[model samples]
Target: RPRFSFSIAAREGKARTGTIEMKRGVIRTPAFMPVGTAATVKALKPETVRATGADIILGNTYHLMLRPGAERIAKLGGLHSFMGWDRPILTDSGGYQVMSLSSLTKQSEEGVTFKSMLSPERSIEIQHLLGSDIVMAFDECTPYPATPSRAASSMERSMRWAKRSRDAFDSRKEQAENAALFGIQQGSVFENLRQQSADALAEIGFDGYAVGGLAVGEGQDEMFRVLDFSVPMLPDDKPHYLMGVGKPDDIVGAVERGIDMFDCVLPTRSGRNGQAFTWDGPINIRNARFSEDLKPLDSECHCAVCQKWSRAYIHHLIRAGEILGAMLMTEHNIAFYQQLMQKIRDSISEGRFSQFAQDFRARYFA
Candidate 1:
């Protein structure tokens, strides 16, 4: 009812370009969403983030639930107004935090019980109260190198949790609102388990499906191998999202394998640490080579930071411990990511994505 739709506009090999039509806005496919884990994109303001061509941003359910509380945010007029971002916002189900933030949490058929924090039930409620446009189903993410039996068991438990997540969200009075719920498929790189998870999620039904349990340090090759088989299991019309997906090259490779959406903290996180991503590999501003190099951050970037600031200046700011250094560097990386996504979409539309990807990785790694 709120214009939630996805249509493929073009295709190149398995890669395709499209749009996710939500009430807040339309997100171009092969979209790379910047992470705004704590209601902000770290050093960047909301308007600044919007100016970087980001169509959407992500928030962390774990952090939000832990601090300020979701109800407080809801009473303060929801996360949109609270965070000053009006575009579509997608939220994780706090599953990742349950594993990463706490090592002793227990996962049962019903859901994960972590300290005082609720599991899927609380995840959905907070997103609803926060007015998230996209909500992910709660799932248990199996660690890498998990045995086959362990992977199968983890996938099965996630499937059961998926059902519970769906039922809980459906029971909400605001279920008919503009927000879209997505189910996450978990298998820990096991193709069979991934297929089973996908099938179970499809059977339960959702507006979209996320390819989770990836980018957990399984290496790029292994992740790609999983995507090769796992991505196609979901429906063609709906969106396929790869959770916590990675560097520029990783994103390009995943798109080549049929994934349409991705979220990652590499850009902003690395920028804060004096690293900058470019058309040609990532560079560290902290390196002495940049101390006197008076060139733009990236020759190909047209962002304000790149257009006006020199590498030497940014290097000095970072070396001198200036906060503006992180801000400017982050601005450029975010812009670069958005620009890369735009290029990917254009290449797909022109049926030249393969060539584009090949050329891109070559320069990026050379």
Candidate 2:
């Protein structure tokens, strides 16, 4: 079993490079976790995900618990074993999906008592059974455009749920010692509630803390505004994660604001849709312009797909609606994201993160 330990290896301004030593492996931060929503990275294998340089992959408790059933997964042998991926797996608390997927929902001191039919206790139990390396505390992902009062009320409930999550983990005893738990901060766009949320989680003392509620269609500026104030409030020693965060630029800005971890479906989702992220920017392979272009998907990318296949080839496959097209494109994008994180880590270590972000953003958005 791996022990949870984090150490800062280097820092540049607010951006820093560090290592998360877990029993399974060492995750280098600032790290990007590819969303393996159903215990699998879509159109890619576990080896393929690792080949793309991913240190860890995220699993969704909501989907897994509902589909295969958490108990079933445990009987078969945990997520890592069931999925055949012997690596770190971070499981979401299932609250977000319960809210999003449920047509009608209700919340209270108990939990999101709604269509999902789960509680904080059940959420924690599911993650534990699935052998989650890091379990996220149950939290209500506060929606965007919410009034301050509503946000405050929602955040307060999430804090109470956080306590329940903590208590549930504590009851596991041995499992609690080996696996880590992360508490989430929620406040919509309210500054004071953000502070209160952070204080609540700090008191509970999770192994890590996540900045939730952002990237819920709040737009870039509003999200950054929350992070600008909210991130600084959390304990500096523990890892700071920004959940469901966004594009290349959004990540760069958040890293600058002091976030250390992130996960999103952007790369794989966009790849399935013929959009490929490059150092220059995202390119639509379905576009006719790429039909005869002999260039690589990304000239800077060292992935086997880019090293061998031409843009013309990928363009043809996508246009013809071939499965291989999605697979190859997903492969390239996953590798691209991992490489982007590597560069960010390098820039921070070399004390040149600001300049790196500026240069990358200018060219990428150009």
Task: For each candidate in the order shown, give its overall lDDT on alpha carbons.
Answer: 0.89, 0.90
> What tens digits encode model 2's per-residue C-alpha lDDT throughout 173-211?
866888899999998888899999999999999999999
Q: What is the lDDT of residue 311 in candidate 1?
A: 97
Note the residue pairs that clash in candidate 2: 2-23
Model 1, residue 111: distance off in Å is 2.3
Residue 164 in model 1: lDDT: 81
- Each model's TM-score, in the order given? 0.97, 0.98
What's the lDDT for candidate 1? 0.89
Off by over 4 Å in 1: 1-3
RMSD of 1: 1.3
**For model 2, what is the error of residue 262's alpha carbon versus the real structure, in angstroms, after optimal superposition?**
0.5
lDDT of 1 by residue, 127-243 (tens): 887788999888888888899999999888888888888887888867546688999988887778888888999999999999988978889998999999999999988999999
